Structure formats: C-alpha cells, structure tokens
Amino acid sequence: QIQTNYDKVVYKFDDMELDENLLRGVFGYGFEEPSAIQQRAIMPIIEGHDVLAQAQSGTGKTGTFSIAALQRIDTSVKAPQALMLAPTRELALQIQKVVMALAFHMDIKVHACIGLRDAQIVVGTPGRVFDNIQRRRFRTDKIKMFILDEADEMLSSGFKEQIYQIFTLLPPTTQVVLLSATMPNDVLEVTTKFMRNPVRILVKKDELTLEGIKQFYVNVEEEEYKYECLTDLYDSISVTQAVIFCNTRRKVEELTTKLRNDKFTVSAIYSDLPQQERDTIMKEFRSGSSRILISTDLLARGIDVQQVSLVINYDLPANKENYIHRIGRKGVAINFVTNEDVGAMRELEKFYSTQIEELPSDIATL
Amino acid sequence: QIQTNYDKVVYKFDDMELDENLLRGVFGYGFEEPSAIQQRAIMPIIEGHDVLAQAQSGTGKTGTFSIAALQRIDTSVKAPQALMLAPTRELALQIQKVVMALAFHMDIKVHACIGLRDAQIVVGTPGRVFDNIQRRRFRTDKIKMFILDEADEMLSSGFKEQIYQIFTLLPPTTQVVLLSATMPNDVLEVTTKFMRNPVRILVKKDELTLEGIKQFYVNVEEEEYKYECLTDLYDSISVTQAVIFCNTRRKVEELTTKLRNDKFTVSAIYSDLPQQERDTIMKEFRSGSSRILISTDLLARGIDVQQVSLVINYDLPANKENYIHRIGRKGVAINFVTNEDVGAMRELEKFYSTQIEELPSDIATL
Amino acid sequence: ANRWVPKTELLDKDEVERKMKSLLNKLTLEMFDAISSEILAIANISVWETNGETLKAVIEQIFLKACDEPHWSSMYAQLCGKVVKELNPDITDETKTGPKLVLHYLVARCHAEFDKGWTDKLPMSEEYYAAASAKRRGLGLVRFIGFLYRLNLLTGKMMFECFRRLMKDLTDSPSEETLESVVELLNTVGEQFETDSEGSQLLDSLFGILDNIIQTAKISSRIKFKLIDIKELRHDKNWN
Amino acid sequence: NRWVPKKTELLDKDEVERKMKSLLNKLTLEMFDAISSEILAIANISVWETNGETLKAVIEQIFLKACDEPHWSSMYAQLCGKVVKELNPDITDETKTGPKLVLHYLVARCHAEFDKGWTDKLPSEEYYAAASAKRRGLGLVRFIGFLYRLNLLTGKMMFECFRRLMKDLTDSPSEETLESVVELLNTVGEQFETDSGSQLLDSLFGILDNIIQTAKISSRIKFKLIDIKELRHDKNW
C-alpha cells in the first residue's frame, strides 16, 4: 500500500480543459462525472507527470489514462505517440474499445498488438509489443507516453523481461503511467527504476454499510412457502429491477426456471460460470433486458449493487459475514426467514447491530 | 474411455466426395491429408449419423466437424442450419475463423454469438446462444446439425442447464455431434439422453519413442563452458531451426539474451507465461520468424515437436521422466553433460534402455 | 402488528390492481407477447360492464407504470398499441367502441395525469421527497407521451400542450433534468411533429429558446452538447 | 574420433566455412541487414586475393544453403542481391570487377550445381541420397526463380531451368516436380513472359493441359495446375 502525495482534485470534466471532440467522446460514452481516480489522476498525466496509481478494477482506471492520453495526442503526427500495455489480449481489446469510443469524434487511429506504424495509439500485451519493436514493425521514436495497466498481473504472468526491454527501447523522456491493484516488491522495483518522482495516488475501496438501506423480513415459516411469498410480493409492490440471493447454485437455477414458468424474465449467475459469462449476464441485466437477477453468495463480493431498488435474500446466508456484501452501500432489503431461520436472523441482528423490522403492509408507498 | 464401433477409414480428402469450393478451402488452408479423427469422423457426420468423438486438442477436431458441416450446408437457405458450441468465446472465435477459412470459396455466412437470423452457421457459447434463442433473435427451425465441442469443459463451466435447454429448443431431428477429451459421468449422461445410436470414435494419443531420433552428447565438463560449445556447434553444422531446453526459467531467459547478443533470433517460452502468449510464440516460430526456441521442461508436455531437425538439452532434466517429452516421436538430439551430469546421463541410459553416443566430428553429414 | 400477509372470470378493483402490478412488473421485451396478451385479457373484461370501468383502470395503471419507469416508456407504449389494436370490439362504454374507445381513453388519461402538473425548480428532506417525485413522474409522463405520439396513439393537440408546458418552464432558468427531457423528446418525436395541425412554427420558437439558453445560460458542457446536436440535427441534417 | 570445441583479418578455407555456416544459420528477416553485412565483410576479403577464391566460396555456400532450405530461398536470394550491390569494386579476379563479377559468379555457380542433375522418379540406403539430390535439385530451381526475379540471372539460365523441368514433365512427373513448376511459374511466370520466351510457356502450359486432362494426379495438384493455367491465359497475371 503506497501513500498519496498529490492533493489536486478536479470534480468536473468541464474543469479539465479537454478538447471538445474528446469531451464529446467521454459524454457520448456514458461518463457524466469523473470517478475517484479520474478526479485525481487525469490532470497530472496530462501535465506530463509520472503517475503511480494503486487502484482496483471498476474504479475508472481505463477511463483515466485513456482520456488523458487522447488529450495529449497530436492529430498531426501520424505515428505511435502513446503505448498502452496489458497482461492479456482480452484486456487489451477492451482498452482499445474504450479508447476508440472516447475518440469517436477525433481523428485518432488506435491499433491492437497481439500496418501499425501509422497508428497514433498502440494497445497490446508485453510479449507481442516487444516482438514488434524488435522486428522494426512499429515506430517508437514518437512515443511520449507509456502506460502499464495492471502491472502486478503483467509481472505475475512472466512479462518482467519484456517490460524491462520496452522501457529501454522507448525515448528516455517517455512519460510513465503505472496502475496496479497491488504494489508488491516486483512492481515497486519497476517503479523505483523506471519512474521519475511519480505522482503517487491510492484509491481505497469504499466501505460498505447498512445505513443507506431499509431492511425488512418475512416469516415464511416453512421452506415450501418461500416461492409463494415471492410471487405474492410482486402483486403488492411495483418493482423496476431486483436481485435475489440463494446459498446454493441448485436453488439459484431451480428458482430461475420456476420464475420463467410464471413469465418472469430472470438472469442467473453462480460460481462455475466463467468470468466472461457472468460479466455479460450482468451487463445485459443492468441494461434492462431482464428484470430479476438470481445470484449465489460466493459472487456477492465481485458483484455490482447499482440503482437496483430491491434486494431479496430468498435464502439466509450460511456465513453471517456475507450479509453486507449482499445489501451494502438507498434501497430496500427483504429477507425470507423460516421457523428455523429465526435464530439465524438473530445472528445477523447482533453481528451488524442493525434492526430488521417485519415487512409491513405499507410497502407500496415505501 | 469409450470404445470405438465404427470401422470406416477414408485416407484422402479426395475420397470424401466433398464439393470443389469446400475442397479448395481445406487445401487452400494448409490441410493436405486428413488426420486420425478426420479419417474416421468426417464421413459419418456427413452421412447424418450422431457422432461421439473422444479426442484431445490438436488432433484436428475443429477441422473434422467444420468440413463436414460446410458440406451439409445448403447455400440456398439463408438461415441457421448448423449450431457450433464451445465453452469459451476465445474458442468460439477460433472455430469461426477456421470455418470461415474453409468456406472462403463458398457462399456461407458464419456468425459468432457471445443480424444472426440470416447466417447459415452459428458459433457461440452455451449461455449466449441460449439467451438469443429465448429472445427470438436467431431462427432455429432450419437447424439440422448441433455440434458440442469440448463437452467436458462446457459442463465443468456450469453450462449444463443451458445445454439441456438448447437440445429441447432445436428440431427433434437435429443431428448431434459431440467431441470431448474426457468422458465423465456428466458428459455420458448427455450422450445417453440426447444422442441416437452414436458413431463412437476414440483417437488415442500416439505413444512417444526414441527410435526415430539419433541422440548424442557433449561433455562440456563445466557449466561455464555450455554456451561456448553451443556457439561452436553453429560453426560446425547447418541448422534450419532448433529447440533448446533448460530446467529453470532464469536460465531460459539468460541463454536467450546471450544468444541475441550474438545476433541469434530466439523465441523463449516458460510456465508463468499465459497460454495465449506461448501459443503465439510457437506459431510465429513454426512459421520461420525465429530459428531458435528455448523452453522450460514443464512445457515439454504441451509442446509440438514438428519437423524441427535439431533438439539441444542445454540442461539435463532433473526429472528423468521428462526426457521423452523433449525428444520423443526423424531428428537429432544433442545433450550437454558436465562432470557432475555424468551420473545423470547414466540414469537416462538405463531408464529408456537407449544409447547416447558421444558427438562425432562427422555431423555436417549426419 | 399491522403487517404484510401472502395468501368466465370477473375481477374487483383490488384483484385488478394486484394482477396488473404483477403483469406490469414482468413486462420485458422477451416476455412481451405473452404478458401483453394476459393484460389484454383483463382489459376485455369490460365486455361485461356498462361504463367500461375495468378497462379505464388498466389504462390508468399502465400510465402510472410508464411514469415511474421511463427506461421502459417505449415498451409500455407498445403495450398500449396492442390494447388499442386487439381490444374486443364488442366493448361498450356508457360515456365509440373497440379501438376508437381506447384511443380516447389514452388521451383522457393523459389530460388527467398532465393537469396534476409539477414544478421544475425543486428546493434530504420531508415533502421534498414528494415534490421531487412529482417532477420525476411528470417528466416521465412527457416521455411516455412521446412514445405514444410516435405510434400515432395520440393526436397533435396533446403534443402541443406538452411542448407548451415544457417551453413555459424552459424560459425560467430550466433545470438540467428539464433540458434533458426536451432533447430526448425532440429525438423521439421531433421529425414527425414537424408536420401537424402550426407545428413546425412551434419548433421554431422552441429552438429559439434553446439558441438563447446555449449562448447565455450556465449549463454543464454535457447538456450544451446535447442542445447543439439537436439544433444541428433539425436545422442542418434535417432529421437525416 | 569425436567432436571438440575451440581488412586487417584473413581467413582460411575452414574458418570461412565455419563462419559462413553460423551466419547463414542466423539469417532471418529480422536480423537480415546485420548478418548480411557480416557476410559481405567475408566476401570483401577477396580484395587481398588474386583469383577471388574466398568470394567464390561465399557464393557456393549460399547456394548450398538455399538448396537445403527452400523456405528461405527468397531471403537467401536477397542476400545475393546485397553482395552484388555492395561488393568492394576494387576486387579483382584473374579469371570484370565489382558487381559484374558477382553476377558472373552467380551464373557460374548455377551451371555448376545444375549440371550435377537429378532424377524425378525415385525408387533405404542410397535411396536417402537420391531423394536428397532431388530435393536439393528442386530447391535449386526454386532459388533460380528468386534470383531471376531480382534480375540477378539472365534468361538463358531460366530457359535451361524450364527446359530441364519440361523434359521431366512429359515422363510421368512426380507431384514434387509439378509442385515446383507451379511455384516457379507463380514467381517468375509474368516476368519471364518477355525475354530473349512466351512461346516457351506455350509449350509448357500445353504439357500441363495434357497432364490435367489425362494424368492421375491428386485433386490438390489438379487445382494448382488449373489455377496457374487461368492465371496466365485468362487473368493474365
């Protein structure tokens, strides 16, 4: 864990002095307000500083270095001016998509590396990018910005040598931006050796609380009645979208097919599914395709609690710890408790020192 | 392990009664003679039989069902006639590439699923393909062939339900082709339930031997002399391409940079590298980009021993078992043995009951 | 404790509301035809009614839905398109039959919801949570009107009244939510509305107010781009 | 017997062969300019020689390489292009100087390797040798093509090449021969059309039309023959 040493926060993109074409790109992509990182890291990068950012995924990392890079790009020069590096080609392609999107209104060619001596931005993996430099495939003399995304992952995937080489093959004055979720010995060595008086930024994941959501429960009494109460709950209150939790994959899939029989539109995620799959499921769900998402408890950590108004714990988490990851933060949480789940809900009662009032009849308003 | 029950082998593509445009595609792609699988599985598929093939990767699986599918495609019908399924999108895209390649001379649109109701062949993952069927996105009424590639992997990645659904959503007369490296309880259940009197084919990996290669050794005496003998060896004999083995990643990378200083062109692979990376390294090497490949012992299993004439064991395998995976099968193997590696080479001597004569001066001929 | 408890054909007020909540809660692009048909089965109950009271309620709840969930306004709009098109022609109201009846219902339900009104400039808090929702549901409505108008389920007179209300609230230091609503409305209905029973000349006054709000008002860059784009879309590109 | 490891500078026969093996073993498209320059430094030794013996050997070994490794024939051909273009003009041979000298060398080394000849129809002992002789023979005809394309050889040598292939193309040709002729036509066909020439291709393509409509050849080969027939006659290269 590195310490922050740069106290300059810009809250609006409007105050970043970006070019209209670029500013149009970011807006016309979804971004409306800069995230934590983007508020602190974008400006220094544009200003030419070396930036060492310790940041987790889904904080706006890709948007941070992509926006700052495009701003620095000279539309006149038709050669590689910035190199973006990633551990995998999948991650490299994603970066390229985002970069291309933000640059929809600009005249900037983005090429992937896994006819690239005329592109103004190169994205690729360490192994491939190195081989291309050695083969004199892409011009490096115009490179002024070198971005290493997820350095910890690149080093753990045996790209040390490759990366080190790249450093020595670029113009000695090349600005270095390095982002990484963790800062191990390996990564810090790169930092010390290849970076000059870096702007050190650290974005801590926001702590979760229950204070933002109103939580209730429903004594279904017996397990056989859980589904009954669920369907009846959709007769009582109006719902935009909801997320349902179960302990096992089996129940997740069983509840899923049952709901589909009653003409519900549901998405289901569990552990055995590839990250690729889950990601799509959640993306299409958060876009409005489906209106119900059933998930197992294991993936309550790497899950996103968007503006989904309602969360239902069909099952009661075997591990008390997992209650926060289910309903943590403005929303509503309704728990399904049986006669034997009473003592279980008591555990959650004392553990978080919170209160779970029984579901009133006045919910249509609430 | 399933038992074979179909004894009909076709040795030449010319005897498969394929269409010229398709036959041109396979040839113009590299394939010149059908592999083990292709010799036994292509025909039955074309003939309409259900095919259960237990096959490893790199045997010609993708080529087998791709060639048979295209042959069965009706260029007139502009709707999905065959569905190809894979565990991952990466694997799905690869399948699509190959299918598109073989169909370069044909008028057949291939669409990936991770405007697809006008494509004649659909390739995708179980989760995505299912969602698209449910959303009435792609027409399934014209489907006559359903291919499940790497069934074991799809089931182990939590695609059981999805797959089962697909089966019931296709025309009941849809021909089923299933390929899988392993045949666990899970996969066999699918087999029994969804397949009709399947042509069962099993391609066993070919056993490796030393009888095909002539092996020598060179008493370098001390470790400090190993590199000396290597460079001198390139002064003595003419080499097209060679593969060098080392025990550790460190030496693999050290030897690599040393050779590059002497203007050698080398590729290096080790364990910490992502499968993606190795695959590219080996592909570009086998294409002639580099003329030397240094690899660690761990990846002597999933490595390809092509027409590379020369193999050099810079280090002597700590595990005697790994000697076969290094030089197993017409080629030449030269071992670097030090004063302390003597007793080590003796182990390999008795273990394989083979003979390793000392490197003669008459190698320019041999 | 006052709590919550679980549990050819006719349905009372409650049974109608409960069944409609469930159905409108299930409405997706995937399960559309199946759920919209069941909703139609509830609207067809009015064949056994004098003043078509049940059908009136169905239209009401759909509007209420479309106003609380703007993300699906276009879909709810199509649900109305189906009800109008596939309604039982034998349905009589003691206050026109078949489709022509539902069209009038839609219009009436608009006027009703619209007359409720709302304010743009909004003062956590108490009544503030209500006045903020009134605006949200108000703007949710103007959006729903647009999707109904595009499907020709509403006349121009209602669209005029809609722009009318937005313009009056567009010359009094408009909020960004209002500007957002007007842009989206113009992207949905703009071209079509260009010709309707004095229509294009209404857009002239509207776009004029925008030109002013672009060159003087202190608005975020994001909003300023949206305004500039639709200005060019109409004047230059001509909706093409 | 066994194996044992070890202009200002001169080099004897062995040192020249050993250094050239290493250099020709390193020749890649990536390390081209660097290695081709070091090979040129060995060829320039002949400035201190009467009969340019070292240069002759350099040309010899390059041919030997190009014939055992057809996959790089085009690259080895460019190495020759560099030697001709960047040779020390002060080099004299007591048997023309500079480039004009290397051009003659290339031609001579062709005739030499070519006169060695080979057979098409191959019958475990001497068979391994007669099979290599054909492989290196066909490897040569390929190398000739890449030299011809770069204008490092005259038409007379290309004629002799087609001449040899045609004679062996009317005697139940092997698939390896047919393969070689197609690839040669794809490499030099168009260019050769005009040379002290087209009427020679007429007789050649005639032999092919016959071998297409009569000979028992694999479908794969039949497609290659049909394609180049259309490429010349219809598409016109």
Ligand SMILES: Nc1ncnc2c1ncn2[C@@H]1O[C@H](COP(=O)(O)O)[C@@H](O)[C@H]1O
């Ligand atoms: N300024 C922003 N506003 C809203 N969402 C953002 C912003 N920047 C990034 N994101 C989202 O954060 C997710 C992960 O970002 P990253 O950490 O860059 O991979 C992406 O899916 C983006 O949609």
Ligand SMILES: Nc1ncnc2c1ncn2[C@@H]1O[C@H](COP(=O)(O)O)[C@@H](O)[C@H]1O
């Ligand atoms: N008939 C064939 N001849 C030569 N190589 C093949 C053939 N079929 C497949 N391959 C190679 O085998 C590899 C793996 O094949 P597959 O098992 O189909 O994934 C591919 O990279 C192909 O290049």
